Each structure stands twice: as structure tokens, then as C-alpha cells.
Amino acid sequence: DIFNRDPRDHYDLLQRLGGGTYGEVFKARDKVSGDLVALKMVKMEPDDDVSTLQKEILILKTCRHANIVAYHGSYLWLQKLWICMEFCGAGSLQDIYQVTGSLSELQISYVCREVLQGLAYLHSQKKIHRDIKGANILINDAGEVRLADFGLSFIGTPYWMAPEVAAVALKGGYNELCDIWSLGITAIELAELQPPLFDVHPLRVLFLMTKSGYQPPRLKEKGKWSAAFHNFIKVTLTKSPKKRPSATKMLSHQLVSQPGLNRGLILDLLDKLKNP
Numbered sequence: 001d002i003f004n005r006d007p008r009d010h011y012d013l014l015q016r017l018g019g020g021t022y023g024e025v026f027k028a029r030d031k032v033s034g035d036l037v038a039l040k041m042v043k044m045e046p047d048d049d050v051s052t053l054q055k056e057i058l059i060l061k062t063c064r065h066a067n068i069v070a071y072h073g074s075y076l077w078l079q080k081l082w083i084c085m086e087f088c089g090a091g092s093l094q095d096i097y098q099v100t101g102s103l104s105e106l107q108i109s110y111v112c113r114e115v116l117q118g119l120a121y122l123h124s125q126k127k128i129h130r131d132i133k134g135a136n137i138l139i140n141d142a143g144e145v146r147l148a149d150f151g152l153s154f155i156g157t158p159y160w161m162a163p164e165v166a167a168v169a170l171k172g173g174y175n176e177l178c179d180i181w182s183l184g185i186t187a188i189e190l191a192e193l194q195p196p197l198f199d200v201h202p203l204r205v206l207f208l209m210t211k212s213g214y215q216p217p218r219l220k221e222k223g224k225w226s227a228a229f230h231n232f233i234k235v236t237l238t239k240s241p242k243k244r245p246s247a248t249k250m251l252s253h254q255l256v257s258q259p260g261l262n263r264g265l266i267l268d269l270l271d272k273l274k275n276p
């Protein structure tokens with residue numbers, strides 16, 4: 001459901017957060033709640049069809065889980081769409097680790113369980129995130145973890161595309177289990193400050209993956225991590241999606257099911273951020 005009103009009534013905008021990849025996102029206080037919200041402002045061109053986004057907004061609203069950024073309500077007004085969202089004060093894990101350096105085996109483990117909690121719920125709703133990485137895992141001042149979900153014309157013009165071709169332009173080859181893979185890369189990203197093959201051209205990384213011989217990547221330093229963290233990487237990055245375990249199966253992995261995993265590990269992290 002979309003509300004048709006100036007949202008500058010309801011909310012005072014307190015600080016501009018957004019930059020390159022996030023675009024325009026504002027920290028804002030709710031005039032009624034007195035509560036803190038993130039307002040993501042979307043720019044809309046005349047020939048941008050509104051009715052097509054209303055289909056992508058349902059998905060955001062009926063996504064109700066602690067481990068997913070809560071949707072509050074969209075606002076169309078003056079050729080702009082403002083999406084109101086749970087605020088996460090520490091921004092993304094990427095913002096964090098670029099200052100704090102590498103995350104610890106136990107820090108990464110709690111992040112891997114909270115994410116799986118969110119993916120396991122998404123999947124149960126037959127939804128697929130498509131973009132698990134550091135930049136899309138957000139952190140609140142409590143040190144709790146929240147998956148940011150978001151929601152091309154030069155893939156071709158569709159008018160001539162045959163239907164099977166059009167089926168892929170919307171769906172990609174994406175599968176619920178492709179989100180699991182991305183977590184494995186993300187875990188390495190948290191460990192190493194960059195995903196495998198960051199120093200390699202993207203096209204080449206795409207070719208290399210589609211070679212028959214392609215080898216799932218690994219943690220650089222053997223001794224630095226437990227057998228558990230090693231096995232978590234091995235299993236999440238299984239090549240064949242037919243054999244890659246689901247998010248519930250992964251929640252019963254020893255790396256994420258161990259005790260002592262909780263938000264303190266991150267509060268540590270958020271302290272490390274204040275006091276270098």
C-alpha cells in the first residue's frame with residue numbers, strides 16, 4: 001500500500017546518509033512515533049511506469065522478520081517515491097570493516113547466522129535476495145543484523161526478445177540457493193576485506209566461473225580459521241546448486257549453531273569503530 005501525500009509533513013529529515021550505490025537515503029524522525037526512520041528517496045522519470053513498481057512494493061511490505069530491514073510505507077509525491085524503513089545507525093558491514101579492518105571468526109559467525117535467519121524466511125516466502133554482500137548487511141546501534149532488500153533497458157529492447165529470452169531478463173538464472181553461495185563469498189569478504197578475484201576484471205571473473213574446470217574459492221590463510229569456518233566456506237560455495245545446502249540446513253552448521261554468538265561481538269566492533 002502506497003500513501004499519496006508530502007512525506008515532509010510526517011517526517012523531519014535529519015541527515016543525508018546516501019552516496020554512490022545507496023543513492024539518496026535520509027536519516028529522519030517520525031513526527032507521530034518520535035521514532036527514527038531511514039527515508040530512501042527514488043527519482044522518477046515521466047516514462048517510468050508507476051504501476052510496475054506497485055508489484056515490487058507488495059514484496060517489501062509482506063516481508064516481516066527481525067533479520068530484514070522493516071518496511072513502514074511508501075510515499076509518491078511531486079514525481080518522487082520516498083520509502084520509509086527501519087534505521088540502522090552503523091550503516092553496512094562494509095562501512096564498518098573499511099575502518100575496523102577484518103572481522104573475527106566469531107563476529108563473522110554471528111553475522112552468518114542472522115543473515116541465514118533472514119534468507120530462511122525470505123525463501124519460505126519463495127523470495128530471493130539476489131545481492132548478499134557486505135554492502136547490503138546493515139547494523140543497528142544495538143549491533144543487531146538486518147538484510148537490506150532494494151526494489152537494465154540495455155540488456156536489449158524486449159519487443160523483439162522471444163518469450164524464453166524475456167523469462168531470463170526478469171528472473172536471471174537465480175535460484176533460492178544462489179543467496180547461500182553469496183553468503184560464503186560475503187564471509188570471506190568479512191575475513192579478508194575483499195571477495196575472491198576483486199583484483200580481476202569482472203567479465204573475466206564471469207568467464208572463469210562458467211568454465212568446466214572452475215574451482216570454488218577459499219580462505220587465504222589455513223591456520224587463521226577453525227575447521228568449522230573452512231567447512232562453512234567449502235559447503236556454502238558448492239559449485240552445483242543441486243548439491244548446495246538450504247539456509248535452514250546451514251543454520252544447523254556448527255559455525256552458526258555454536259553458543260556465545262550474539263550482538264555483543266558487534267558492539268565490540270562498533271566500539272572498535274569509535275576508538276581506533
Ligand SMILES: OC[C@]1(F)CN=C(Nc2cc(F)c(Oc3ccnc4[nH]cc(C(F)(F)F)c34)c(F)c2)OC1
Nearest residue numbers: 017018019020021022025038086087088091092148
Ligand atoms: O556509496 C557508499 C557511501 F559513499 C559510503 N557509505 C555509505 N553508507 C550507507 C549509506 C546509506 F544511506 C545507507 O542506507 C541506510 C542507512 C541507515 N539505515 C538504513 N535502513 C535502510 C537503509 C537502506 F536505504 F536500505 F540502505 C539504510 C547505508 F546502509 C549505508 O553510503 C555512502
